[PDB]
Design a protein around this ligand. Sequence first.
Ligand SMILES: [Mg+2]
Ligand SMILES: [Mg+2]
Ligand SMILES: [Mg+2]
Ligand SMILES: [Mg+2]
Ligand SMILES: [Mg+2]
Ligand SMILES: [Mg+2]
Ligand SMILES: [Mg+2]
Lengths: 134, 169, 146, 45, 126, 104, 49
Amino acid sequence: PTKTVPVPKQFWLEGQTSHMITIPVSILGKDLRLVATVAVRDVSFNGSYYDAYKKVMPYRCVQPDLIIPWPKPDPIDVQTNLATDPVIAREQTFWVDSVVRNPIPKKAIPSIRNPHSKYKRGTLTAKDIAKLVA
Amino acid sequence: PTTSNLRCPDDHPLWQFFSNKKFIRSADDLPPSSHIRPWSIPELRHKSFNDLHSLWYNCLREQNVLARENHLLKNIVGSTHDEFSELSNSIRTTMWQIRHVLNERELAYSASREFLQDESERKKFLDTLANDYFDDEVASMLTRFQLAIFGDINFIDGIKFLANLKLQR
Amino acid sequence: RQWRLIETRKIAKQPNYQKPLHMPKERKKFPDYKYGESNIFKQSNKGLYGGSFVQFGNNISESKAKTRKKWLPNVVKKGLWSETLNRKISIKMTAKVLKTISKEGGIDNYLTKEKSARIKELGPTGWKLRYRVLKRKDEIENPPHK
Amino acid sequence: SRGNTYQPSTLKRKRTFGFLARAKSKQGSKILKRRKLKGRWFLSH
Amino acid sequence: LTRPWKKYRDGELFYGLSKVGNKRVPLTTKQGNKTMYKGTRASGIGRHTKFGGYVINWKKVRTYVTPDMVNFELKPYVNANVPPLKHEFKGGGPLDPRLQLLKIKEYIVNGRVQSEGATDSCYKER
Amino acid sequence: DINVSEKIYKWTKAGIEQGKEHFKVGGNKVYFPKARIILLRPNAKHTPYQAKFIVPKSFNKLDLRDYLYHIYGLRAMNITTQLLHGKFNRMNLQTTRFREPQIK
Amino acid sequence: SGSYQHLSNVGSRVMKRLGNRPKNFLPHSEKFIKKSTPEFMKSDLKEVD
RNA sequence: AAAUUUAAUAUAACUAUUAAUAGAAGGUUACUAAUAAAUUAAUAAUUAAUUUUAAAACCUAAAGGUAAACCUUUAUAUUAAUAAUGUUAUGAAUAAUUAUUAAUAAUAAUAAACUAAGUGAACUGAAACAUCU
RNA sequence: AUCAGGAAAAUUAAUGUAUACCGUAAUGUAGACCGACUCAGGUAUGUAAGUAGAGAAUAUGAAGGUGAAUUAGAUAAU
Ligand SMILES: [Mg+2]
Ligand SMILES: [Mg+2]
Ligand SMILES: [Mg+2]
Ligand SMILES: [Mg+2]
Ligand SMILES: [Mg+2]
Ligand SMILES: [Mg+2]
Ligand SMILES: [Mg+2]
């Protein structure tokens, strides 16, 4: 479905002579089916491998033997300053090591976790109990 | 007054609030969400404290640059595109993950300490370790590591243990 | 008689402890009174009233003209000797209570009488007094070393 | 000439009708509770 | 006129859209007497003086501690080509002491050996 | 000896010479600050030697100075705070009044 | 715009009220929205929460 | 062989009855106040059940105040013990800062109806009214 | 003079100081407050050019401010 609607010069593409342009309207998945000259209809979704899509992708079953694969995820060349490179991201710079010196300074604890937290409660000692009961 | 009278420094620390020397990051010059992914908690889990700190600071810096830009977009042009906002949100998520991991590590350490304090189990653990370790150079290395880990009362105890080990071998 | 305004009082059942959001700073010196403190004729909590309270009834004329009136017990402030405490204890005292005390032979005796009725018709102050006396007695009987 | 009976002064108004004033006294507490039960959005100045 | 596009007398206000409104609303710094001081969680820093001044106490003044060894290679985002990692913890919780002990033992045996040095990994860790 | 202002100035100078802090670092360390600052464009009244930021409502002047030095290696010599009024805004007119942010 | 709304979250309750409009009066708001958008921006499909 | 209608069902109404089961956060504005597992069953991802676990700003009579969402205390606390450090007076003594270990307190937001108890009107009815109601 | 006139928180010496938070627009004898209205009402304090004069009376007005959500004509009776 592609409706023809008059669009401003702001949103013009390099070529559009008239203000009139044809553009695609969205469609509900319920109103369109899978092809493979075929029409799938019902899909099962039971098994589930991981593509390395880099995610655990389920199997599309039509009749559970016939599997239709997911399409090929488009390649993507990362060349941004704000994205760290893979190897660096993945590297290991912390092993548990000690049981005497903590991993983080005493002074940095307030930053990562709230003292004066009103949900602490704690206690419930024997001495305390003794103190309360008459 | 004229600006020719000035000599605006090129490496002035206030340029650090912009991407490169640029008023707005263009739609083309932003990192698209297809490429960018926020840091995972598990992945972070094995990262040093210093490195984590550095990462956090970097994130903050990035947010600042986004933040300014976002403000400009909102207040002046009055745009609703919110790419910058999304980016900021992503950064925030990462930051929170980092924070969580930091907390978690501390908690783990505390737990370990508690376990150690329970003297019945700790002794058993030590014994098991000894058994496991019982090459000579390799043993020495392992023993050295153990000593380091151990490292006034505690120190004394460690020393005693070392002595005992030596006696045994 | 009936102890309706005593044995009807109810206090928040304590949860026993094998912590609470707000624990008190001090230590409960005295044992909890079963029936608690009276929220009805609070004048009574200061002393020994014998479970007597203010009644409210009708003044009635020769024309049967009703008009609300109250009835007070005959309270008297009275310093009375306690052998166990070794001092005179002054308190508010319904004259009935005084009479009872006289009959029974001493304030300690009155306090330390076992029956549930007696317990009911002590106040919180009365209860405290009883605790003091019995504890003292125990101490007298039983030094730390036999 | 009547009509101008309300002579605003922020101090007086917060001190008399303010949330803190209400919450401090038993009667005030009652009022606040009443307003909560009605579901009023604004419990007092 | 106040505004020349409205010539005729309409139901328009000198400023704004309505004189009235909810007056029972949290008050800010700007409103109140001279004596009304609101404050904005900014200064529990020092101590006021007997005379009106303010003596700062630095044992309580927030400073921000940037790490001296800045790893600039760590960036706010990560490459999409890296899949998200999924730790496993069958030996109850990541903050389980037993697991930590095991890890320590492993470290002692080995000494700084990387588990996810291979960038090509769905789940791992024990 | 000499008076207080002079002393302060001297201290500042010394700090500058050193290439460290030109102000007494508070013995109160925060490691992971969530705060952010917006760099604003300069008004007609501001010089090129002045820059201004929108900062947290709960931000201290001292804190801002510290923050700039540590995160951005920027030496802020003098700092001036300006808290802005929140004006009442209302959308529908059937909807309640409320104030816009007090911004610092 | 010229607001500073983005820097704050104020009128939180009000926002919630206007954000979480009961679903049976969703037709109303949506109609208005439809009315106040150009032909190229608007779409015939109903939003999901 | 797909569509159309009819009747029933939602996370998405309230009201009355009957039957079953059980007895529970609001606000304010921002340096926004996030989660992490395990085990068992179903079939590596899975959903469910059973669990442990992180965070969680400020206010909502009683840390102590106030003009609710602020201020003031100062658990990035004090004391002790030690360790590196600079100064002074005579290897020993005194004070200052940082760092580890130990000791020492922390936060009344909590319903409503129902129940029991204390006090307890009057209008009204009596074709007036006071006994009575 | 008679009317008889507030309350409450010390010195020296040695050692010190990096100076927090908030108010700050404009309006304020008013179109920006209280009066249902851009309402001849109500609303606290200081300075209030000279000339003149007993004065903050009264006249003028240097400077500053203002000439307005009704105009234009006509001006019967009233
Ligand atoms: Mg009125
Ligand atoms: Mg009064
Ligand atoms: Mg008005
Ligand atoms: Mg004002
Ligand atoms: Mg005050
Ligand atoms: Mg009753
Ligand atoms: Mg007027």
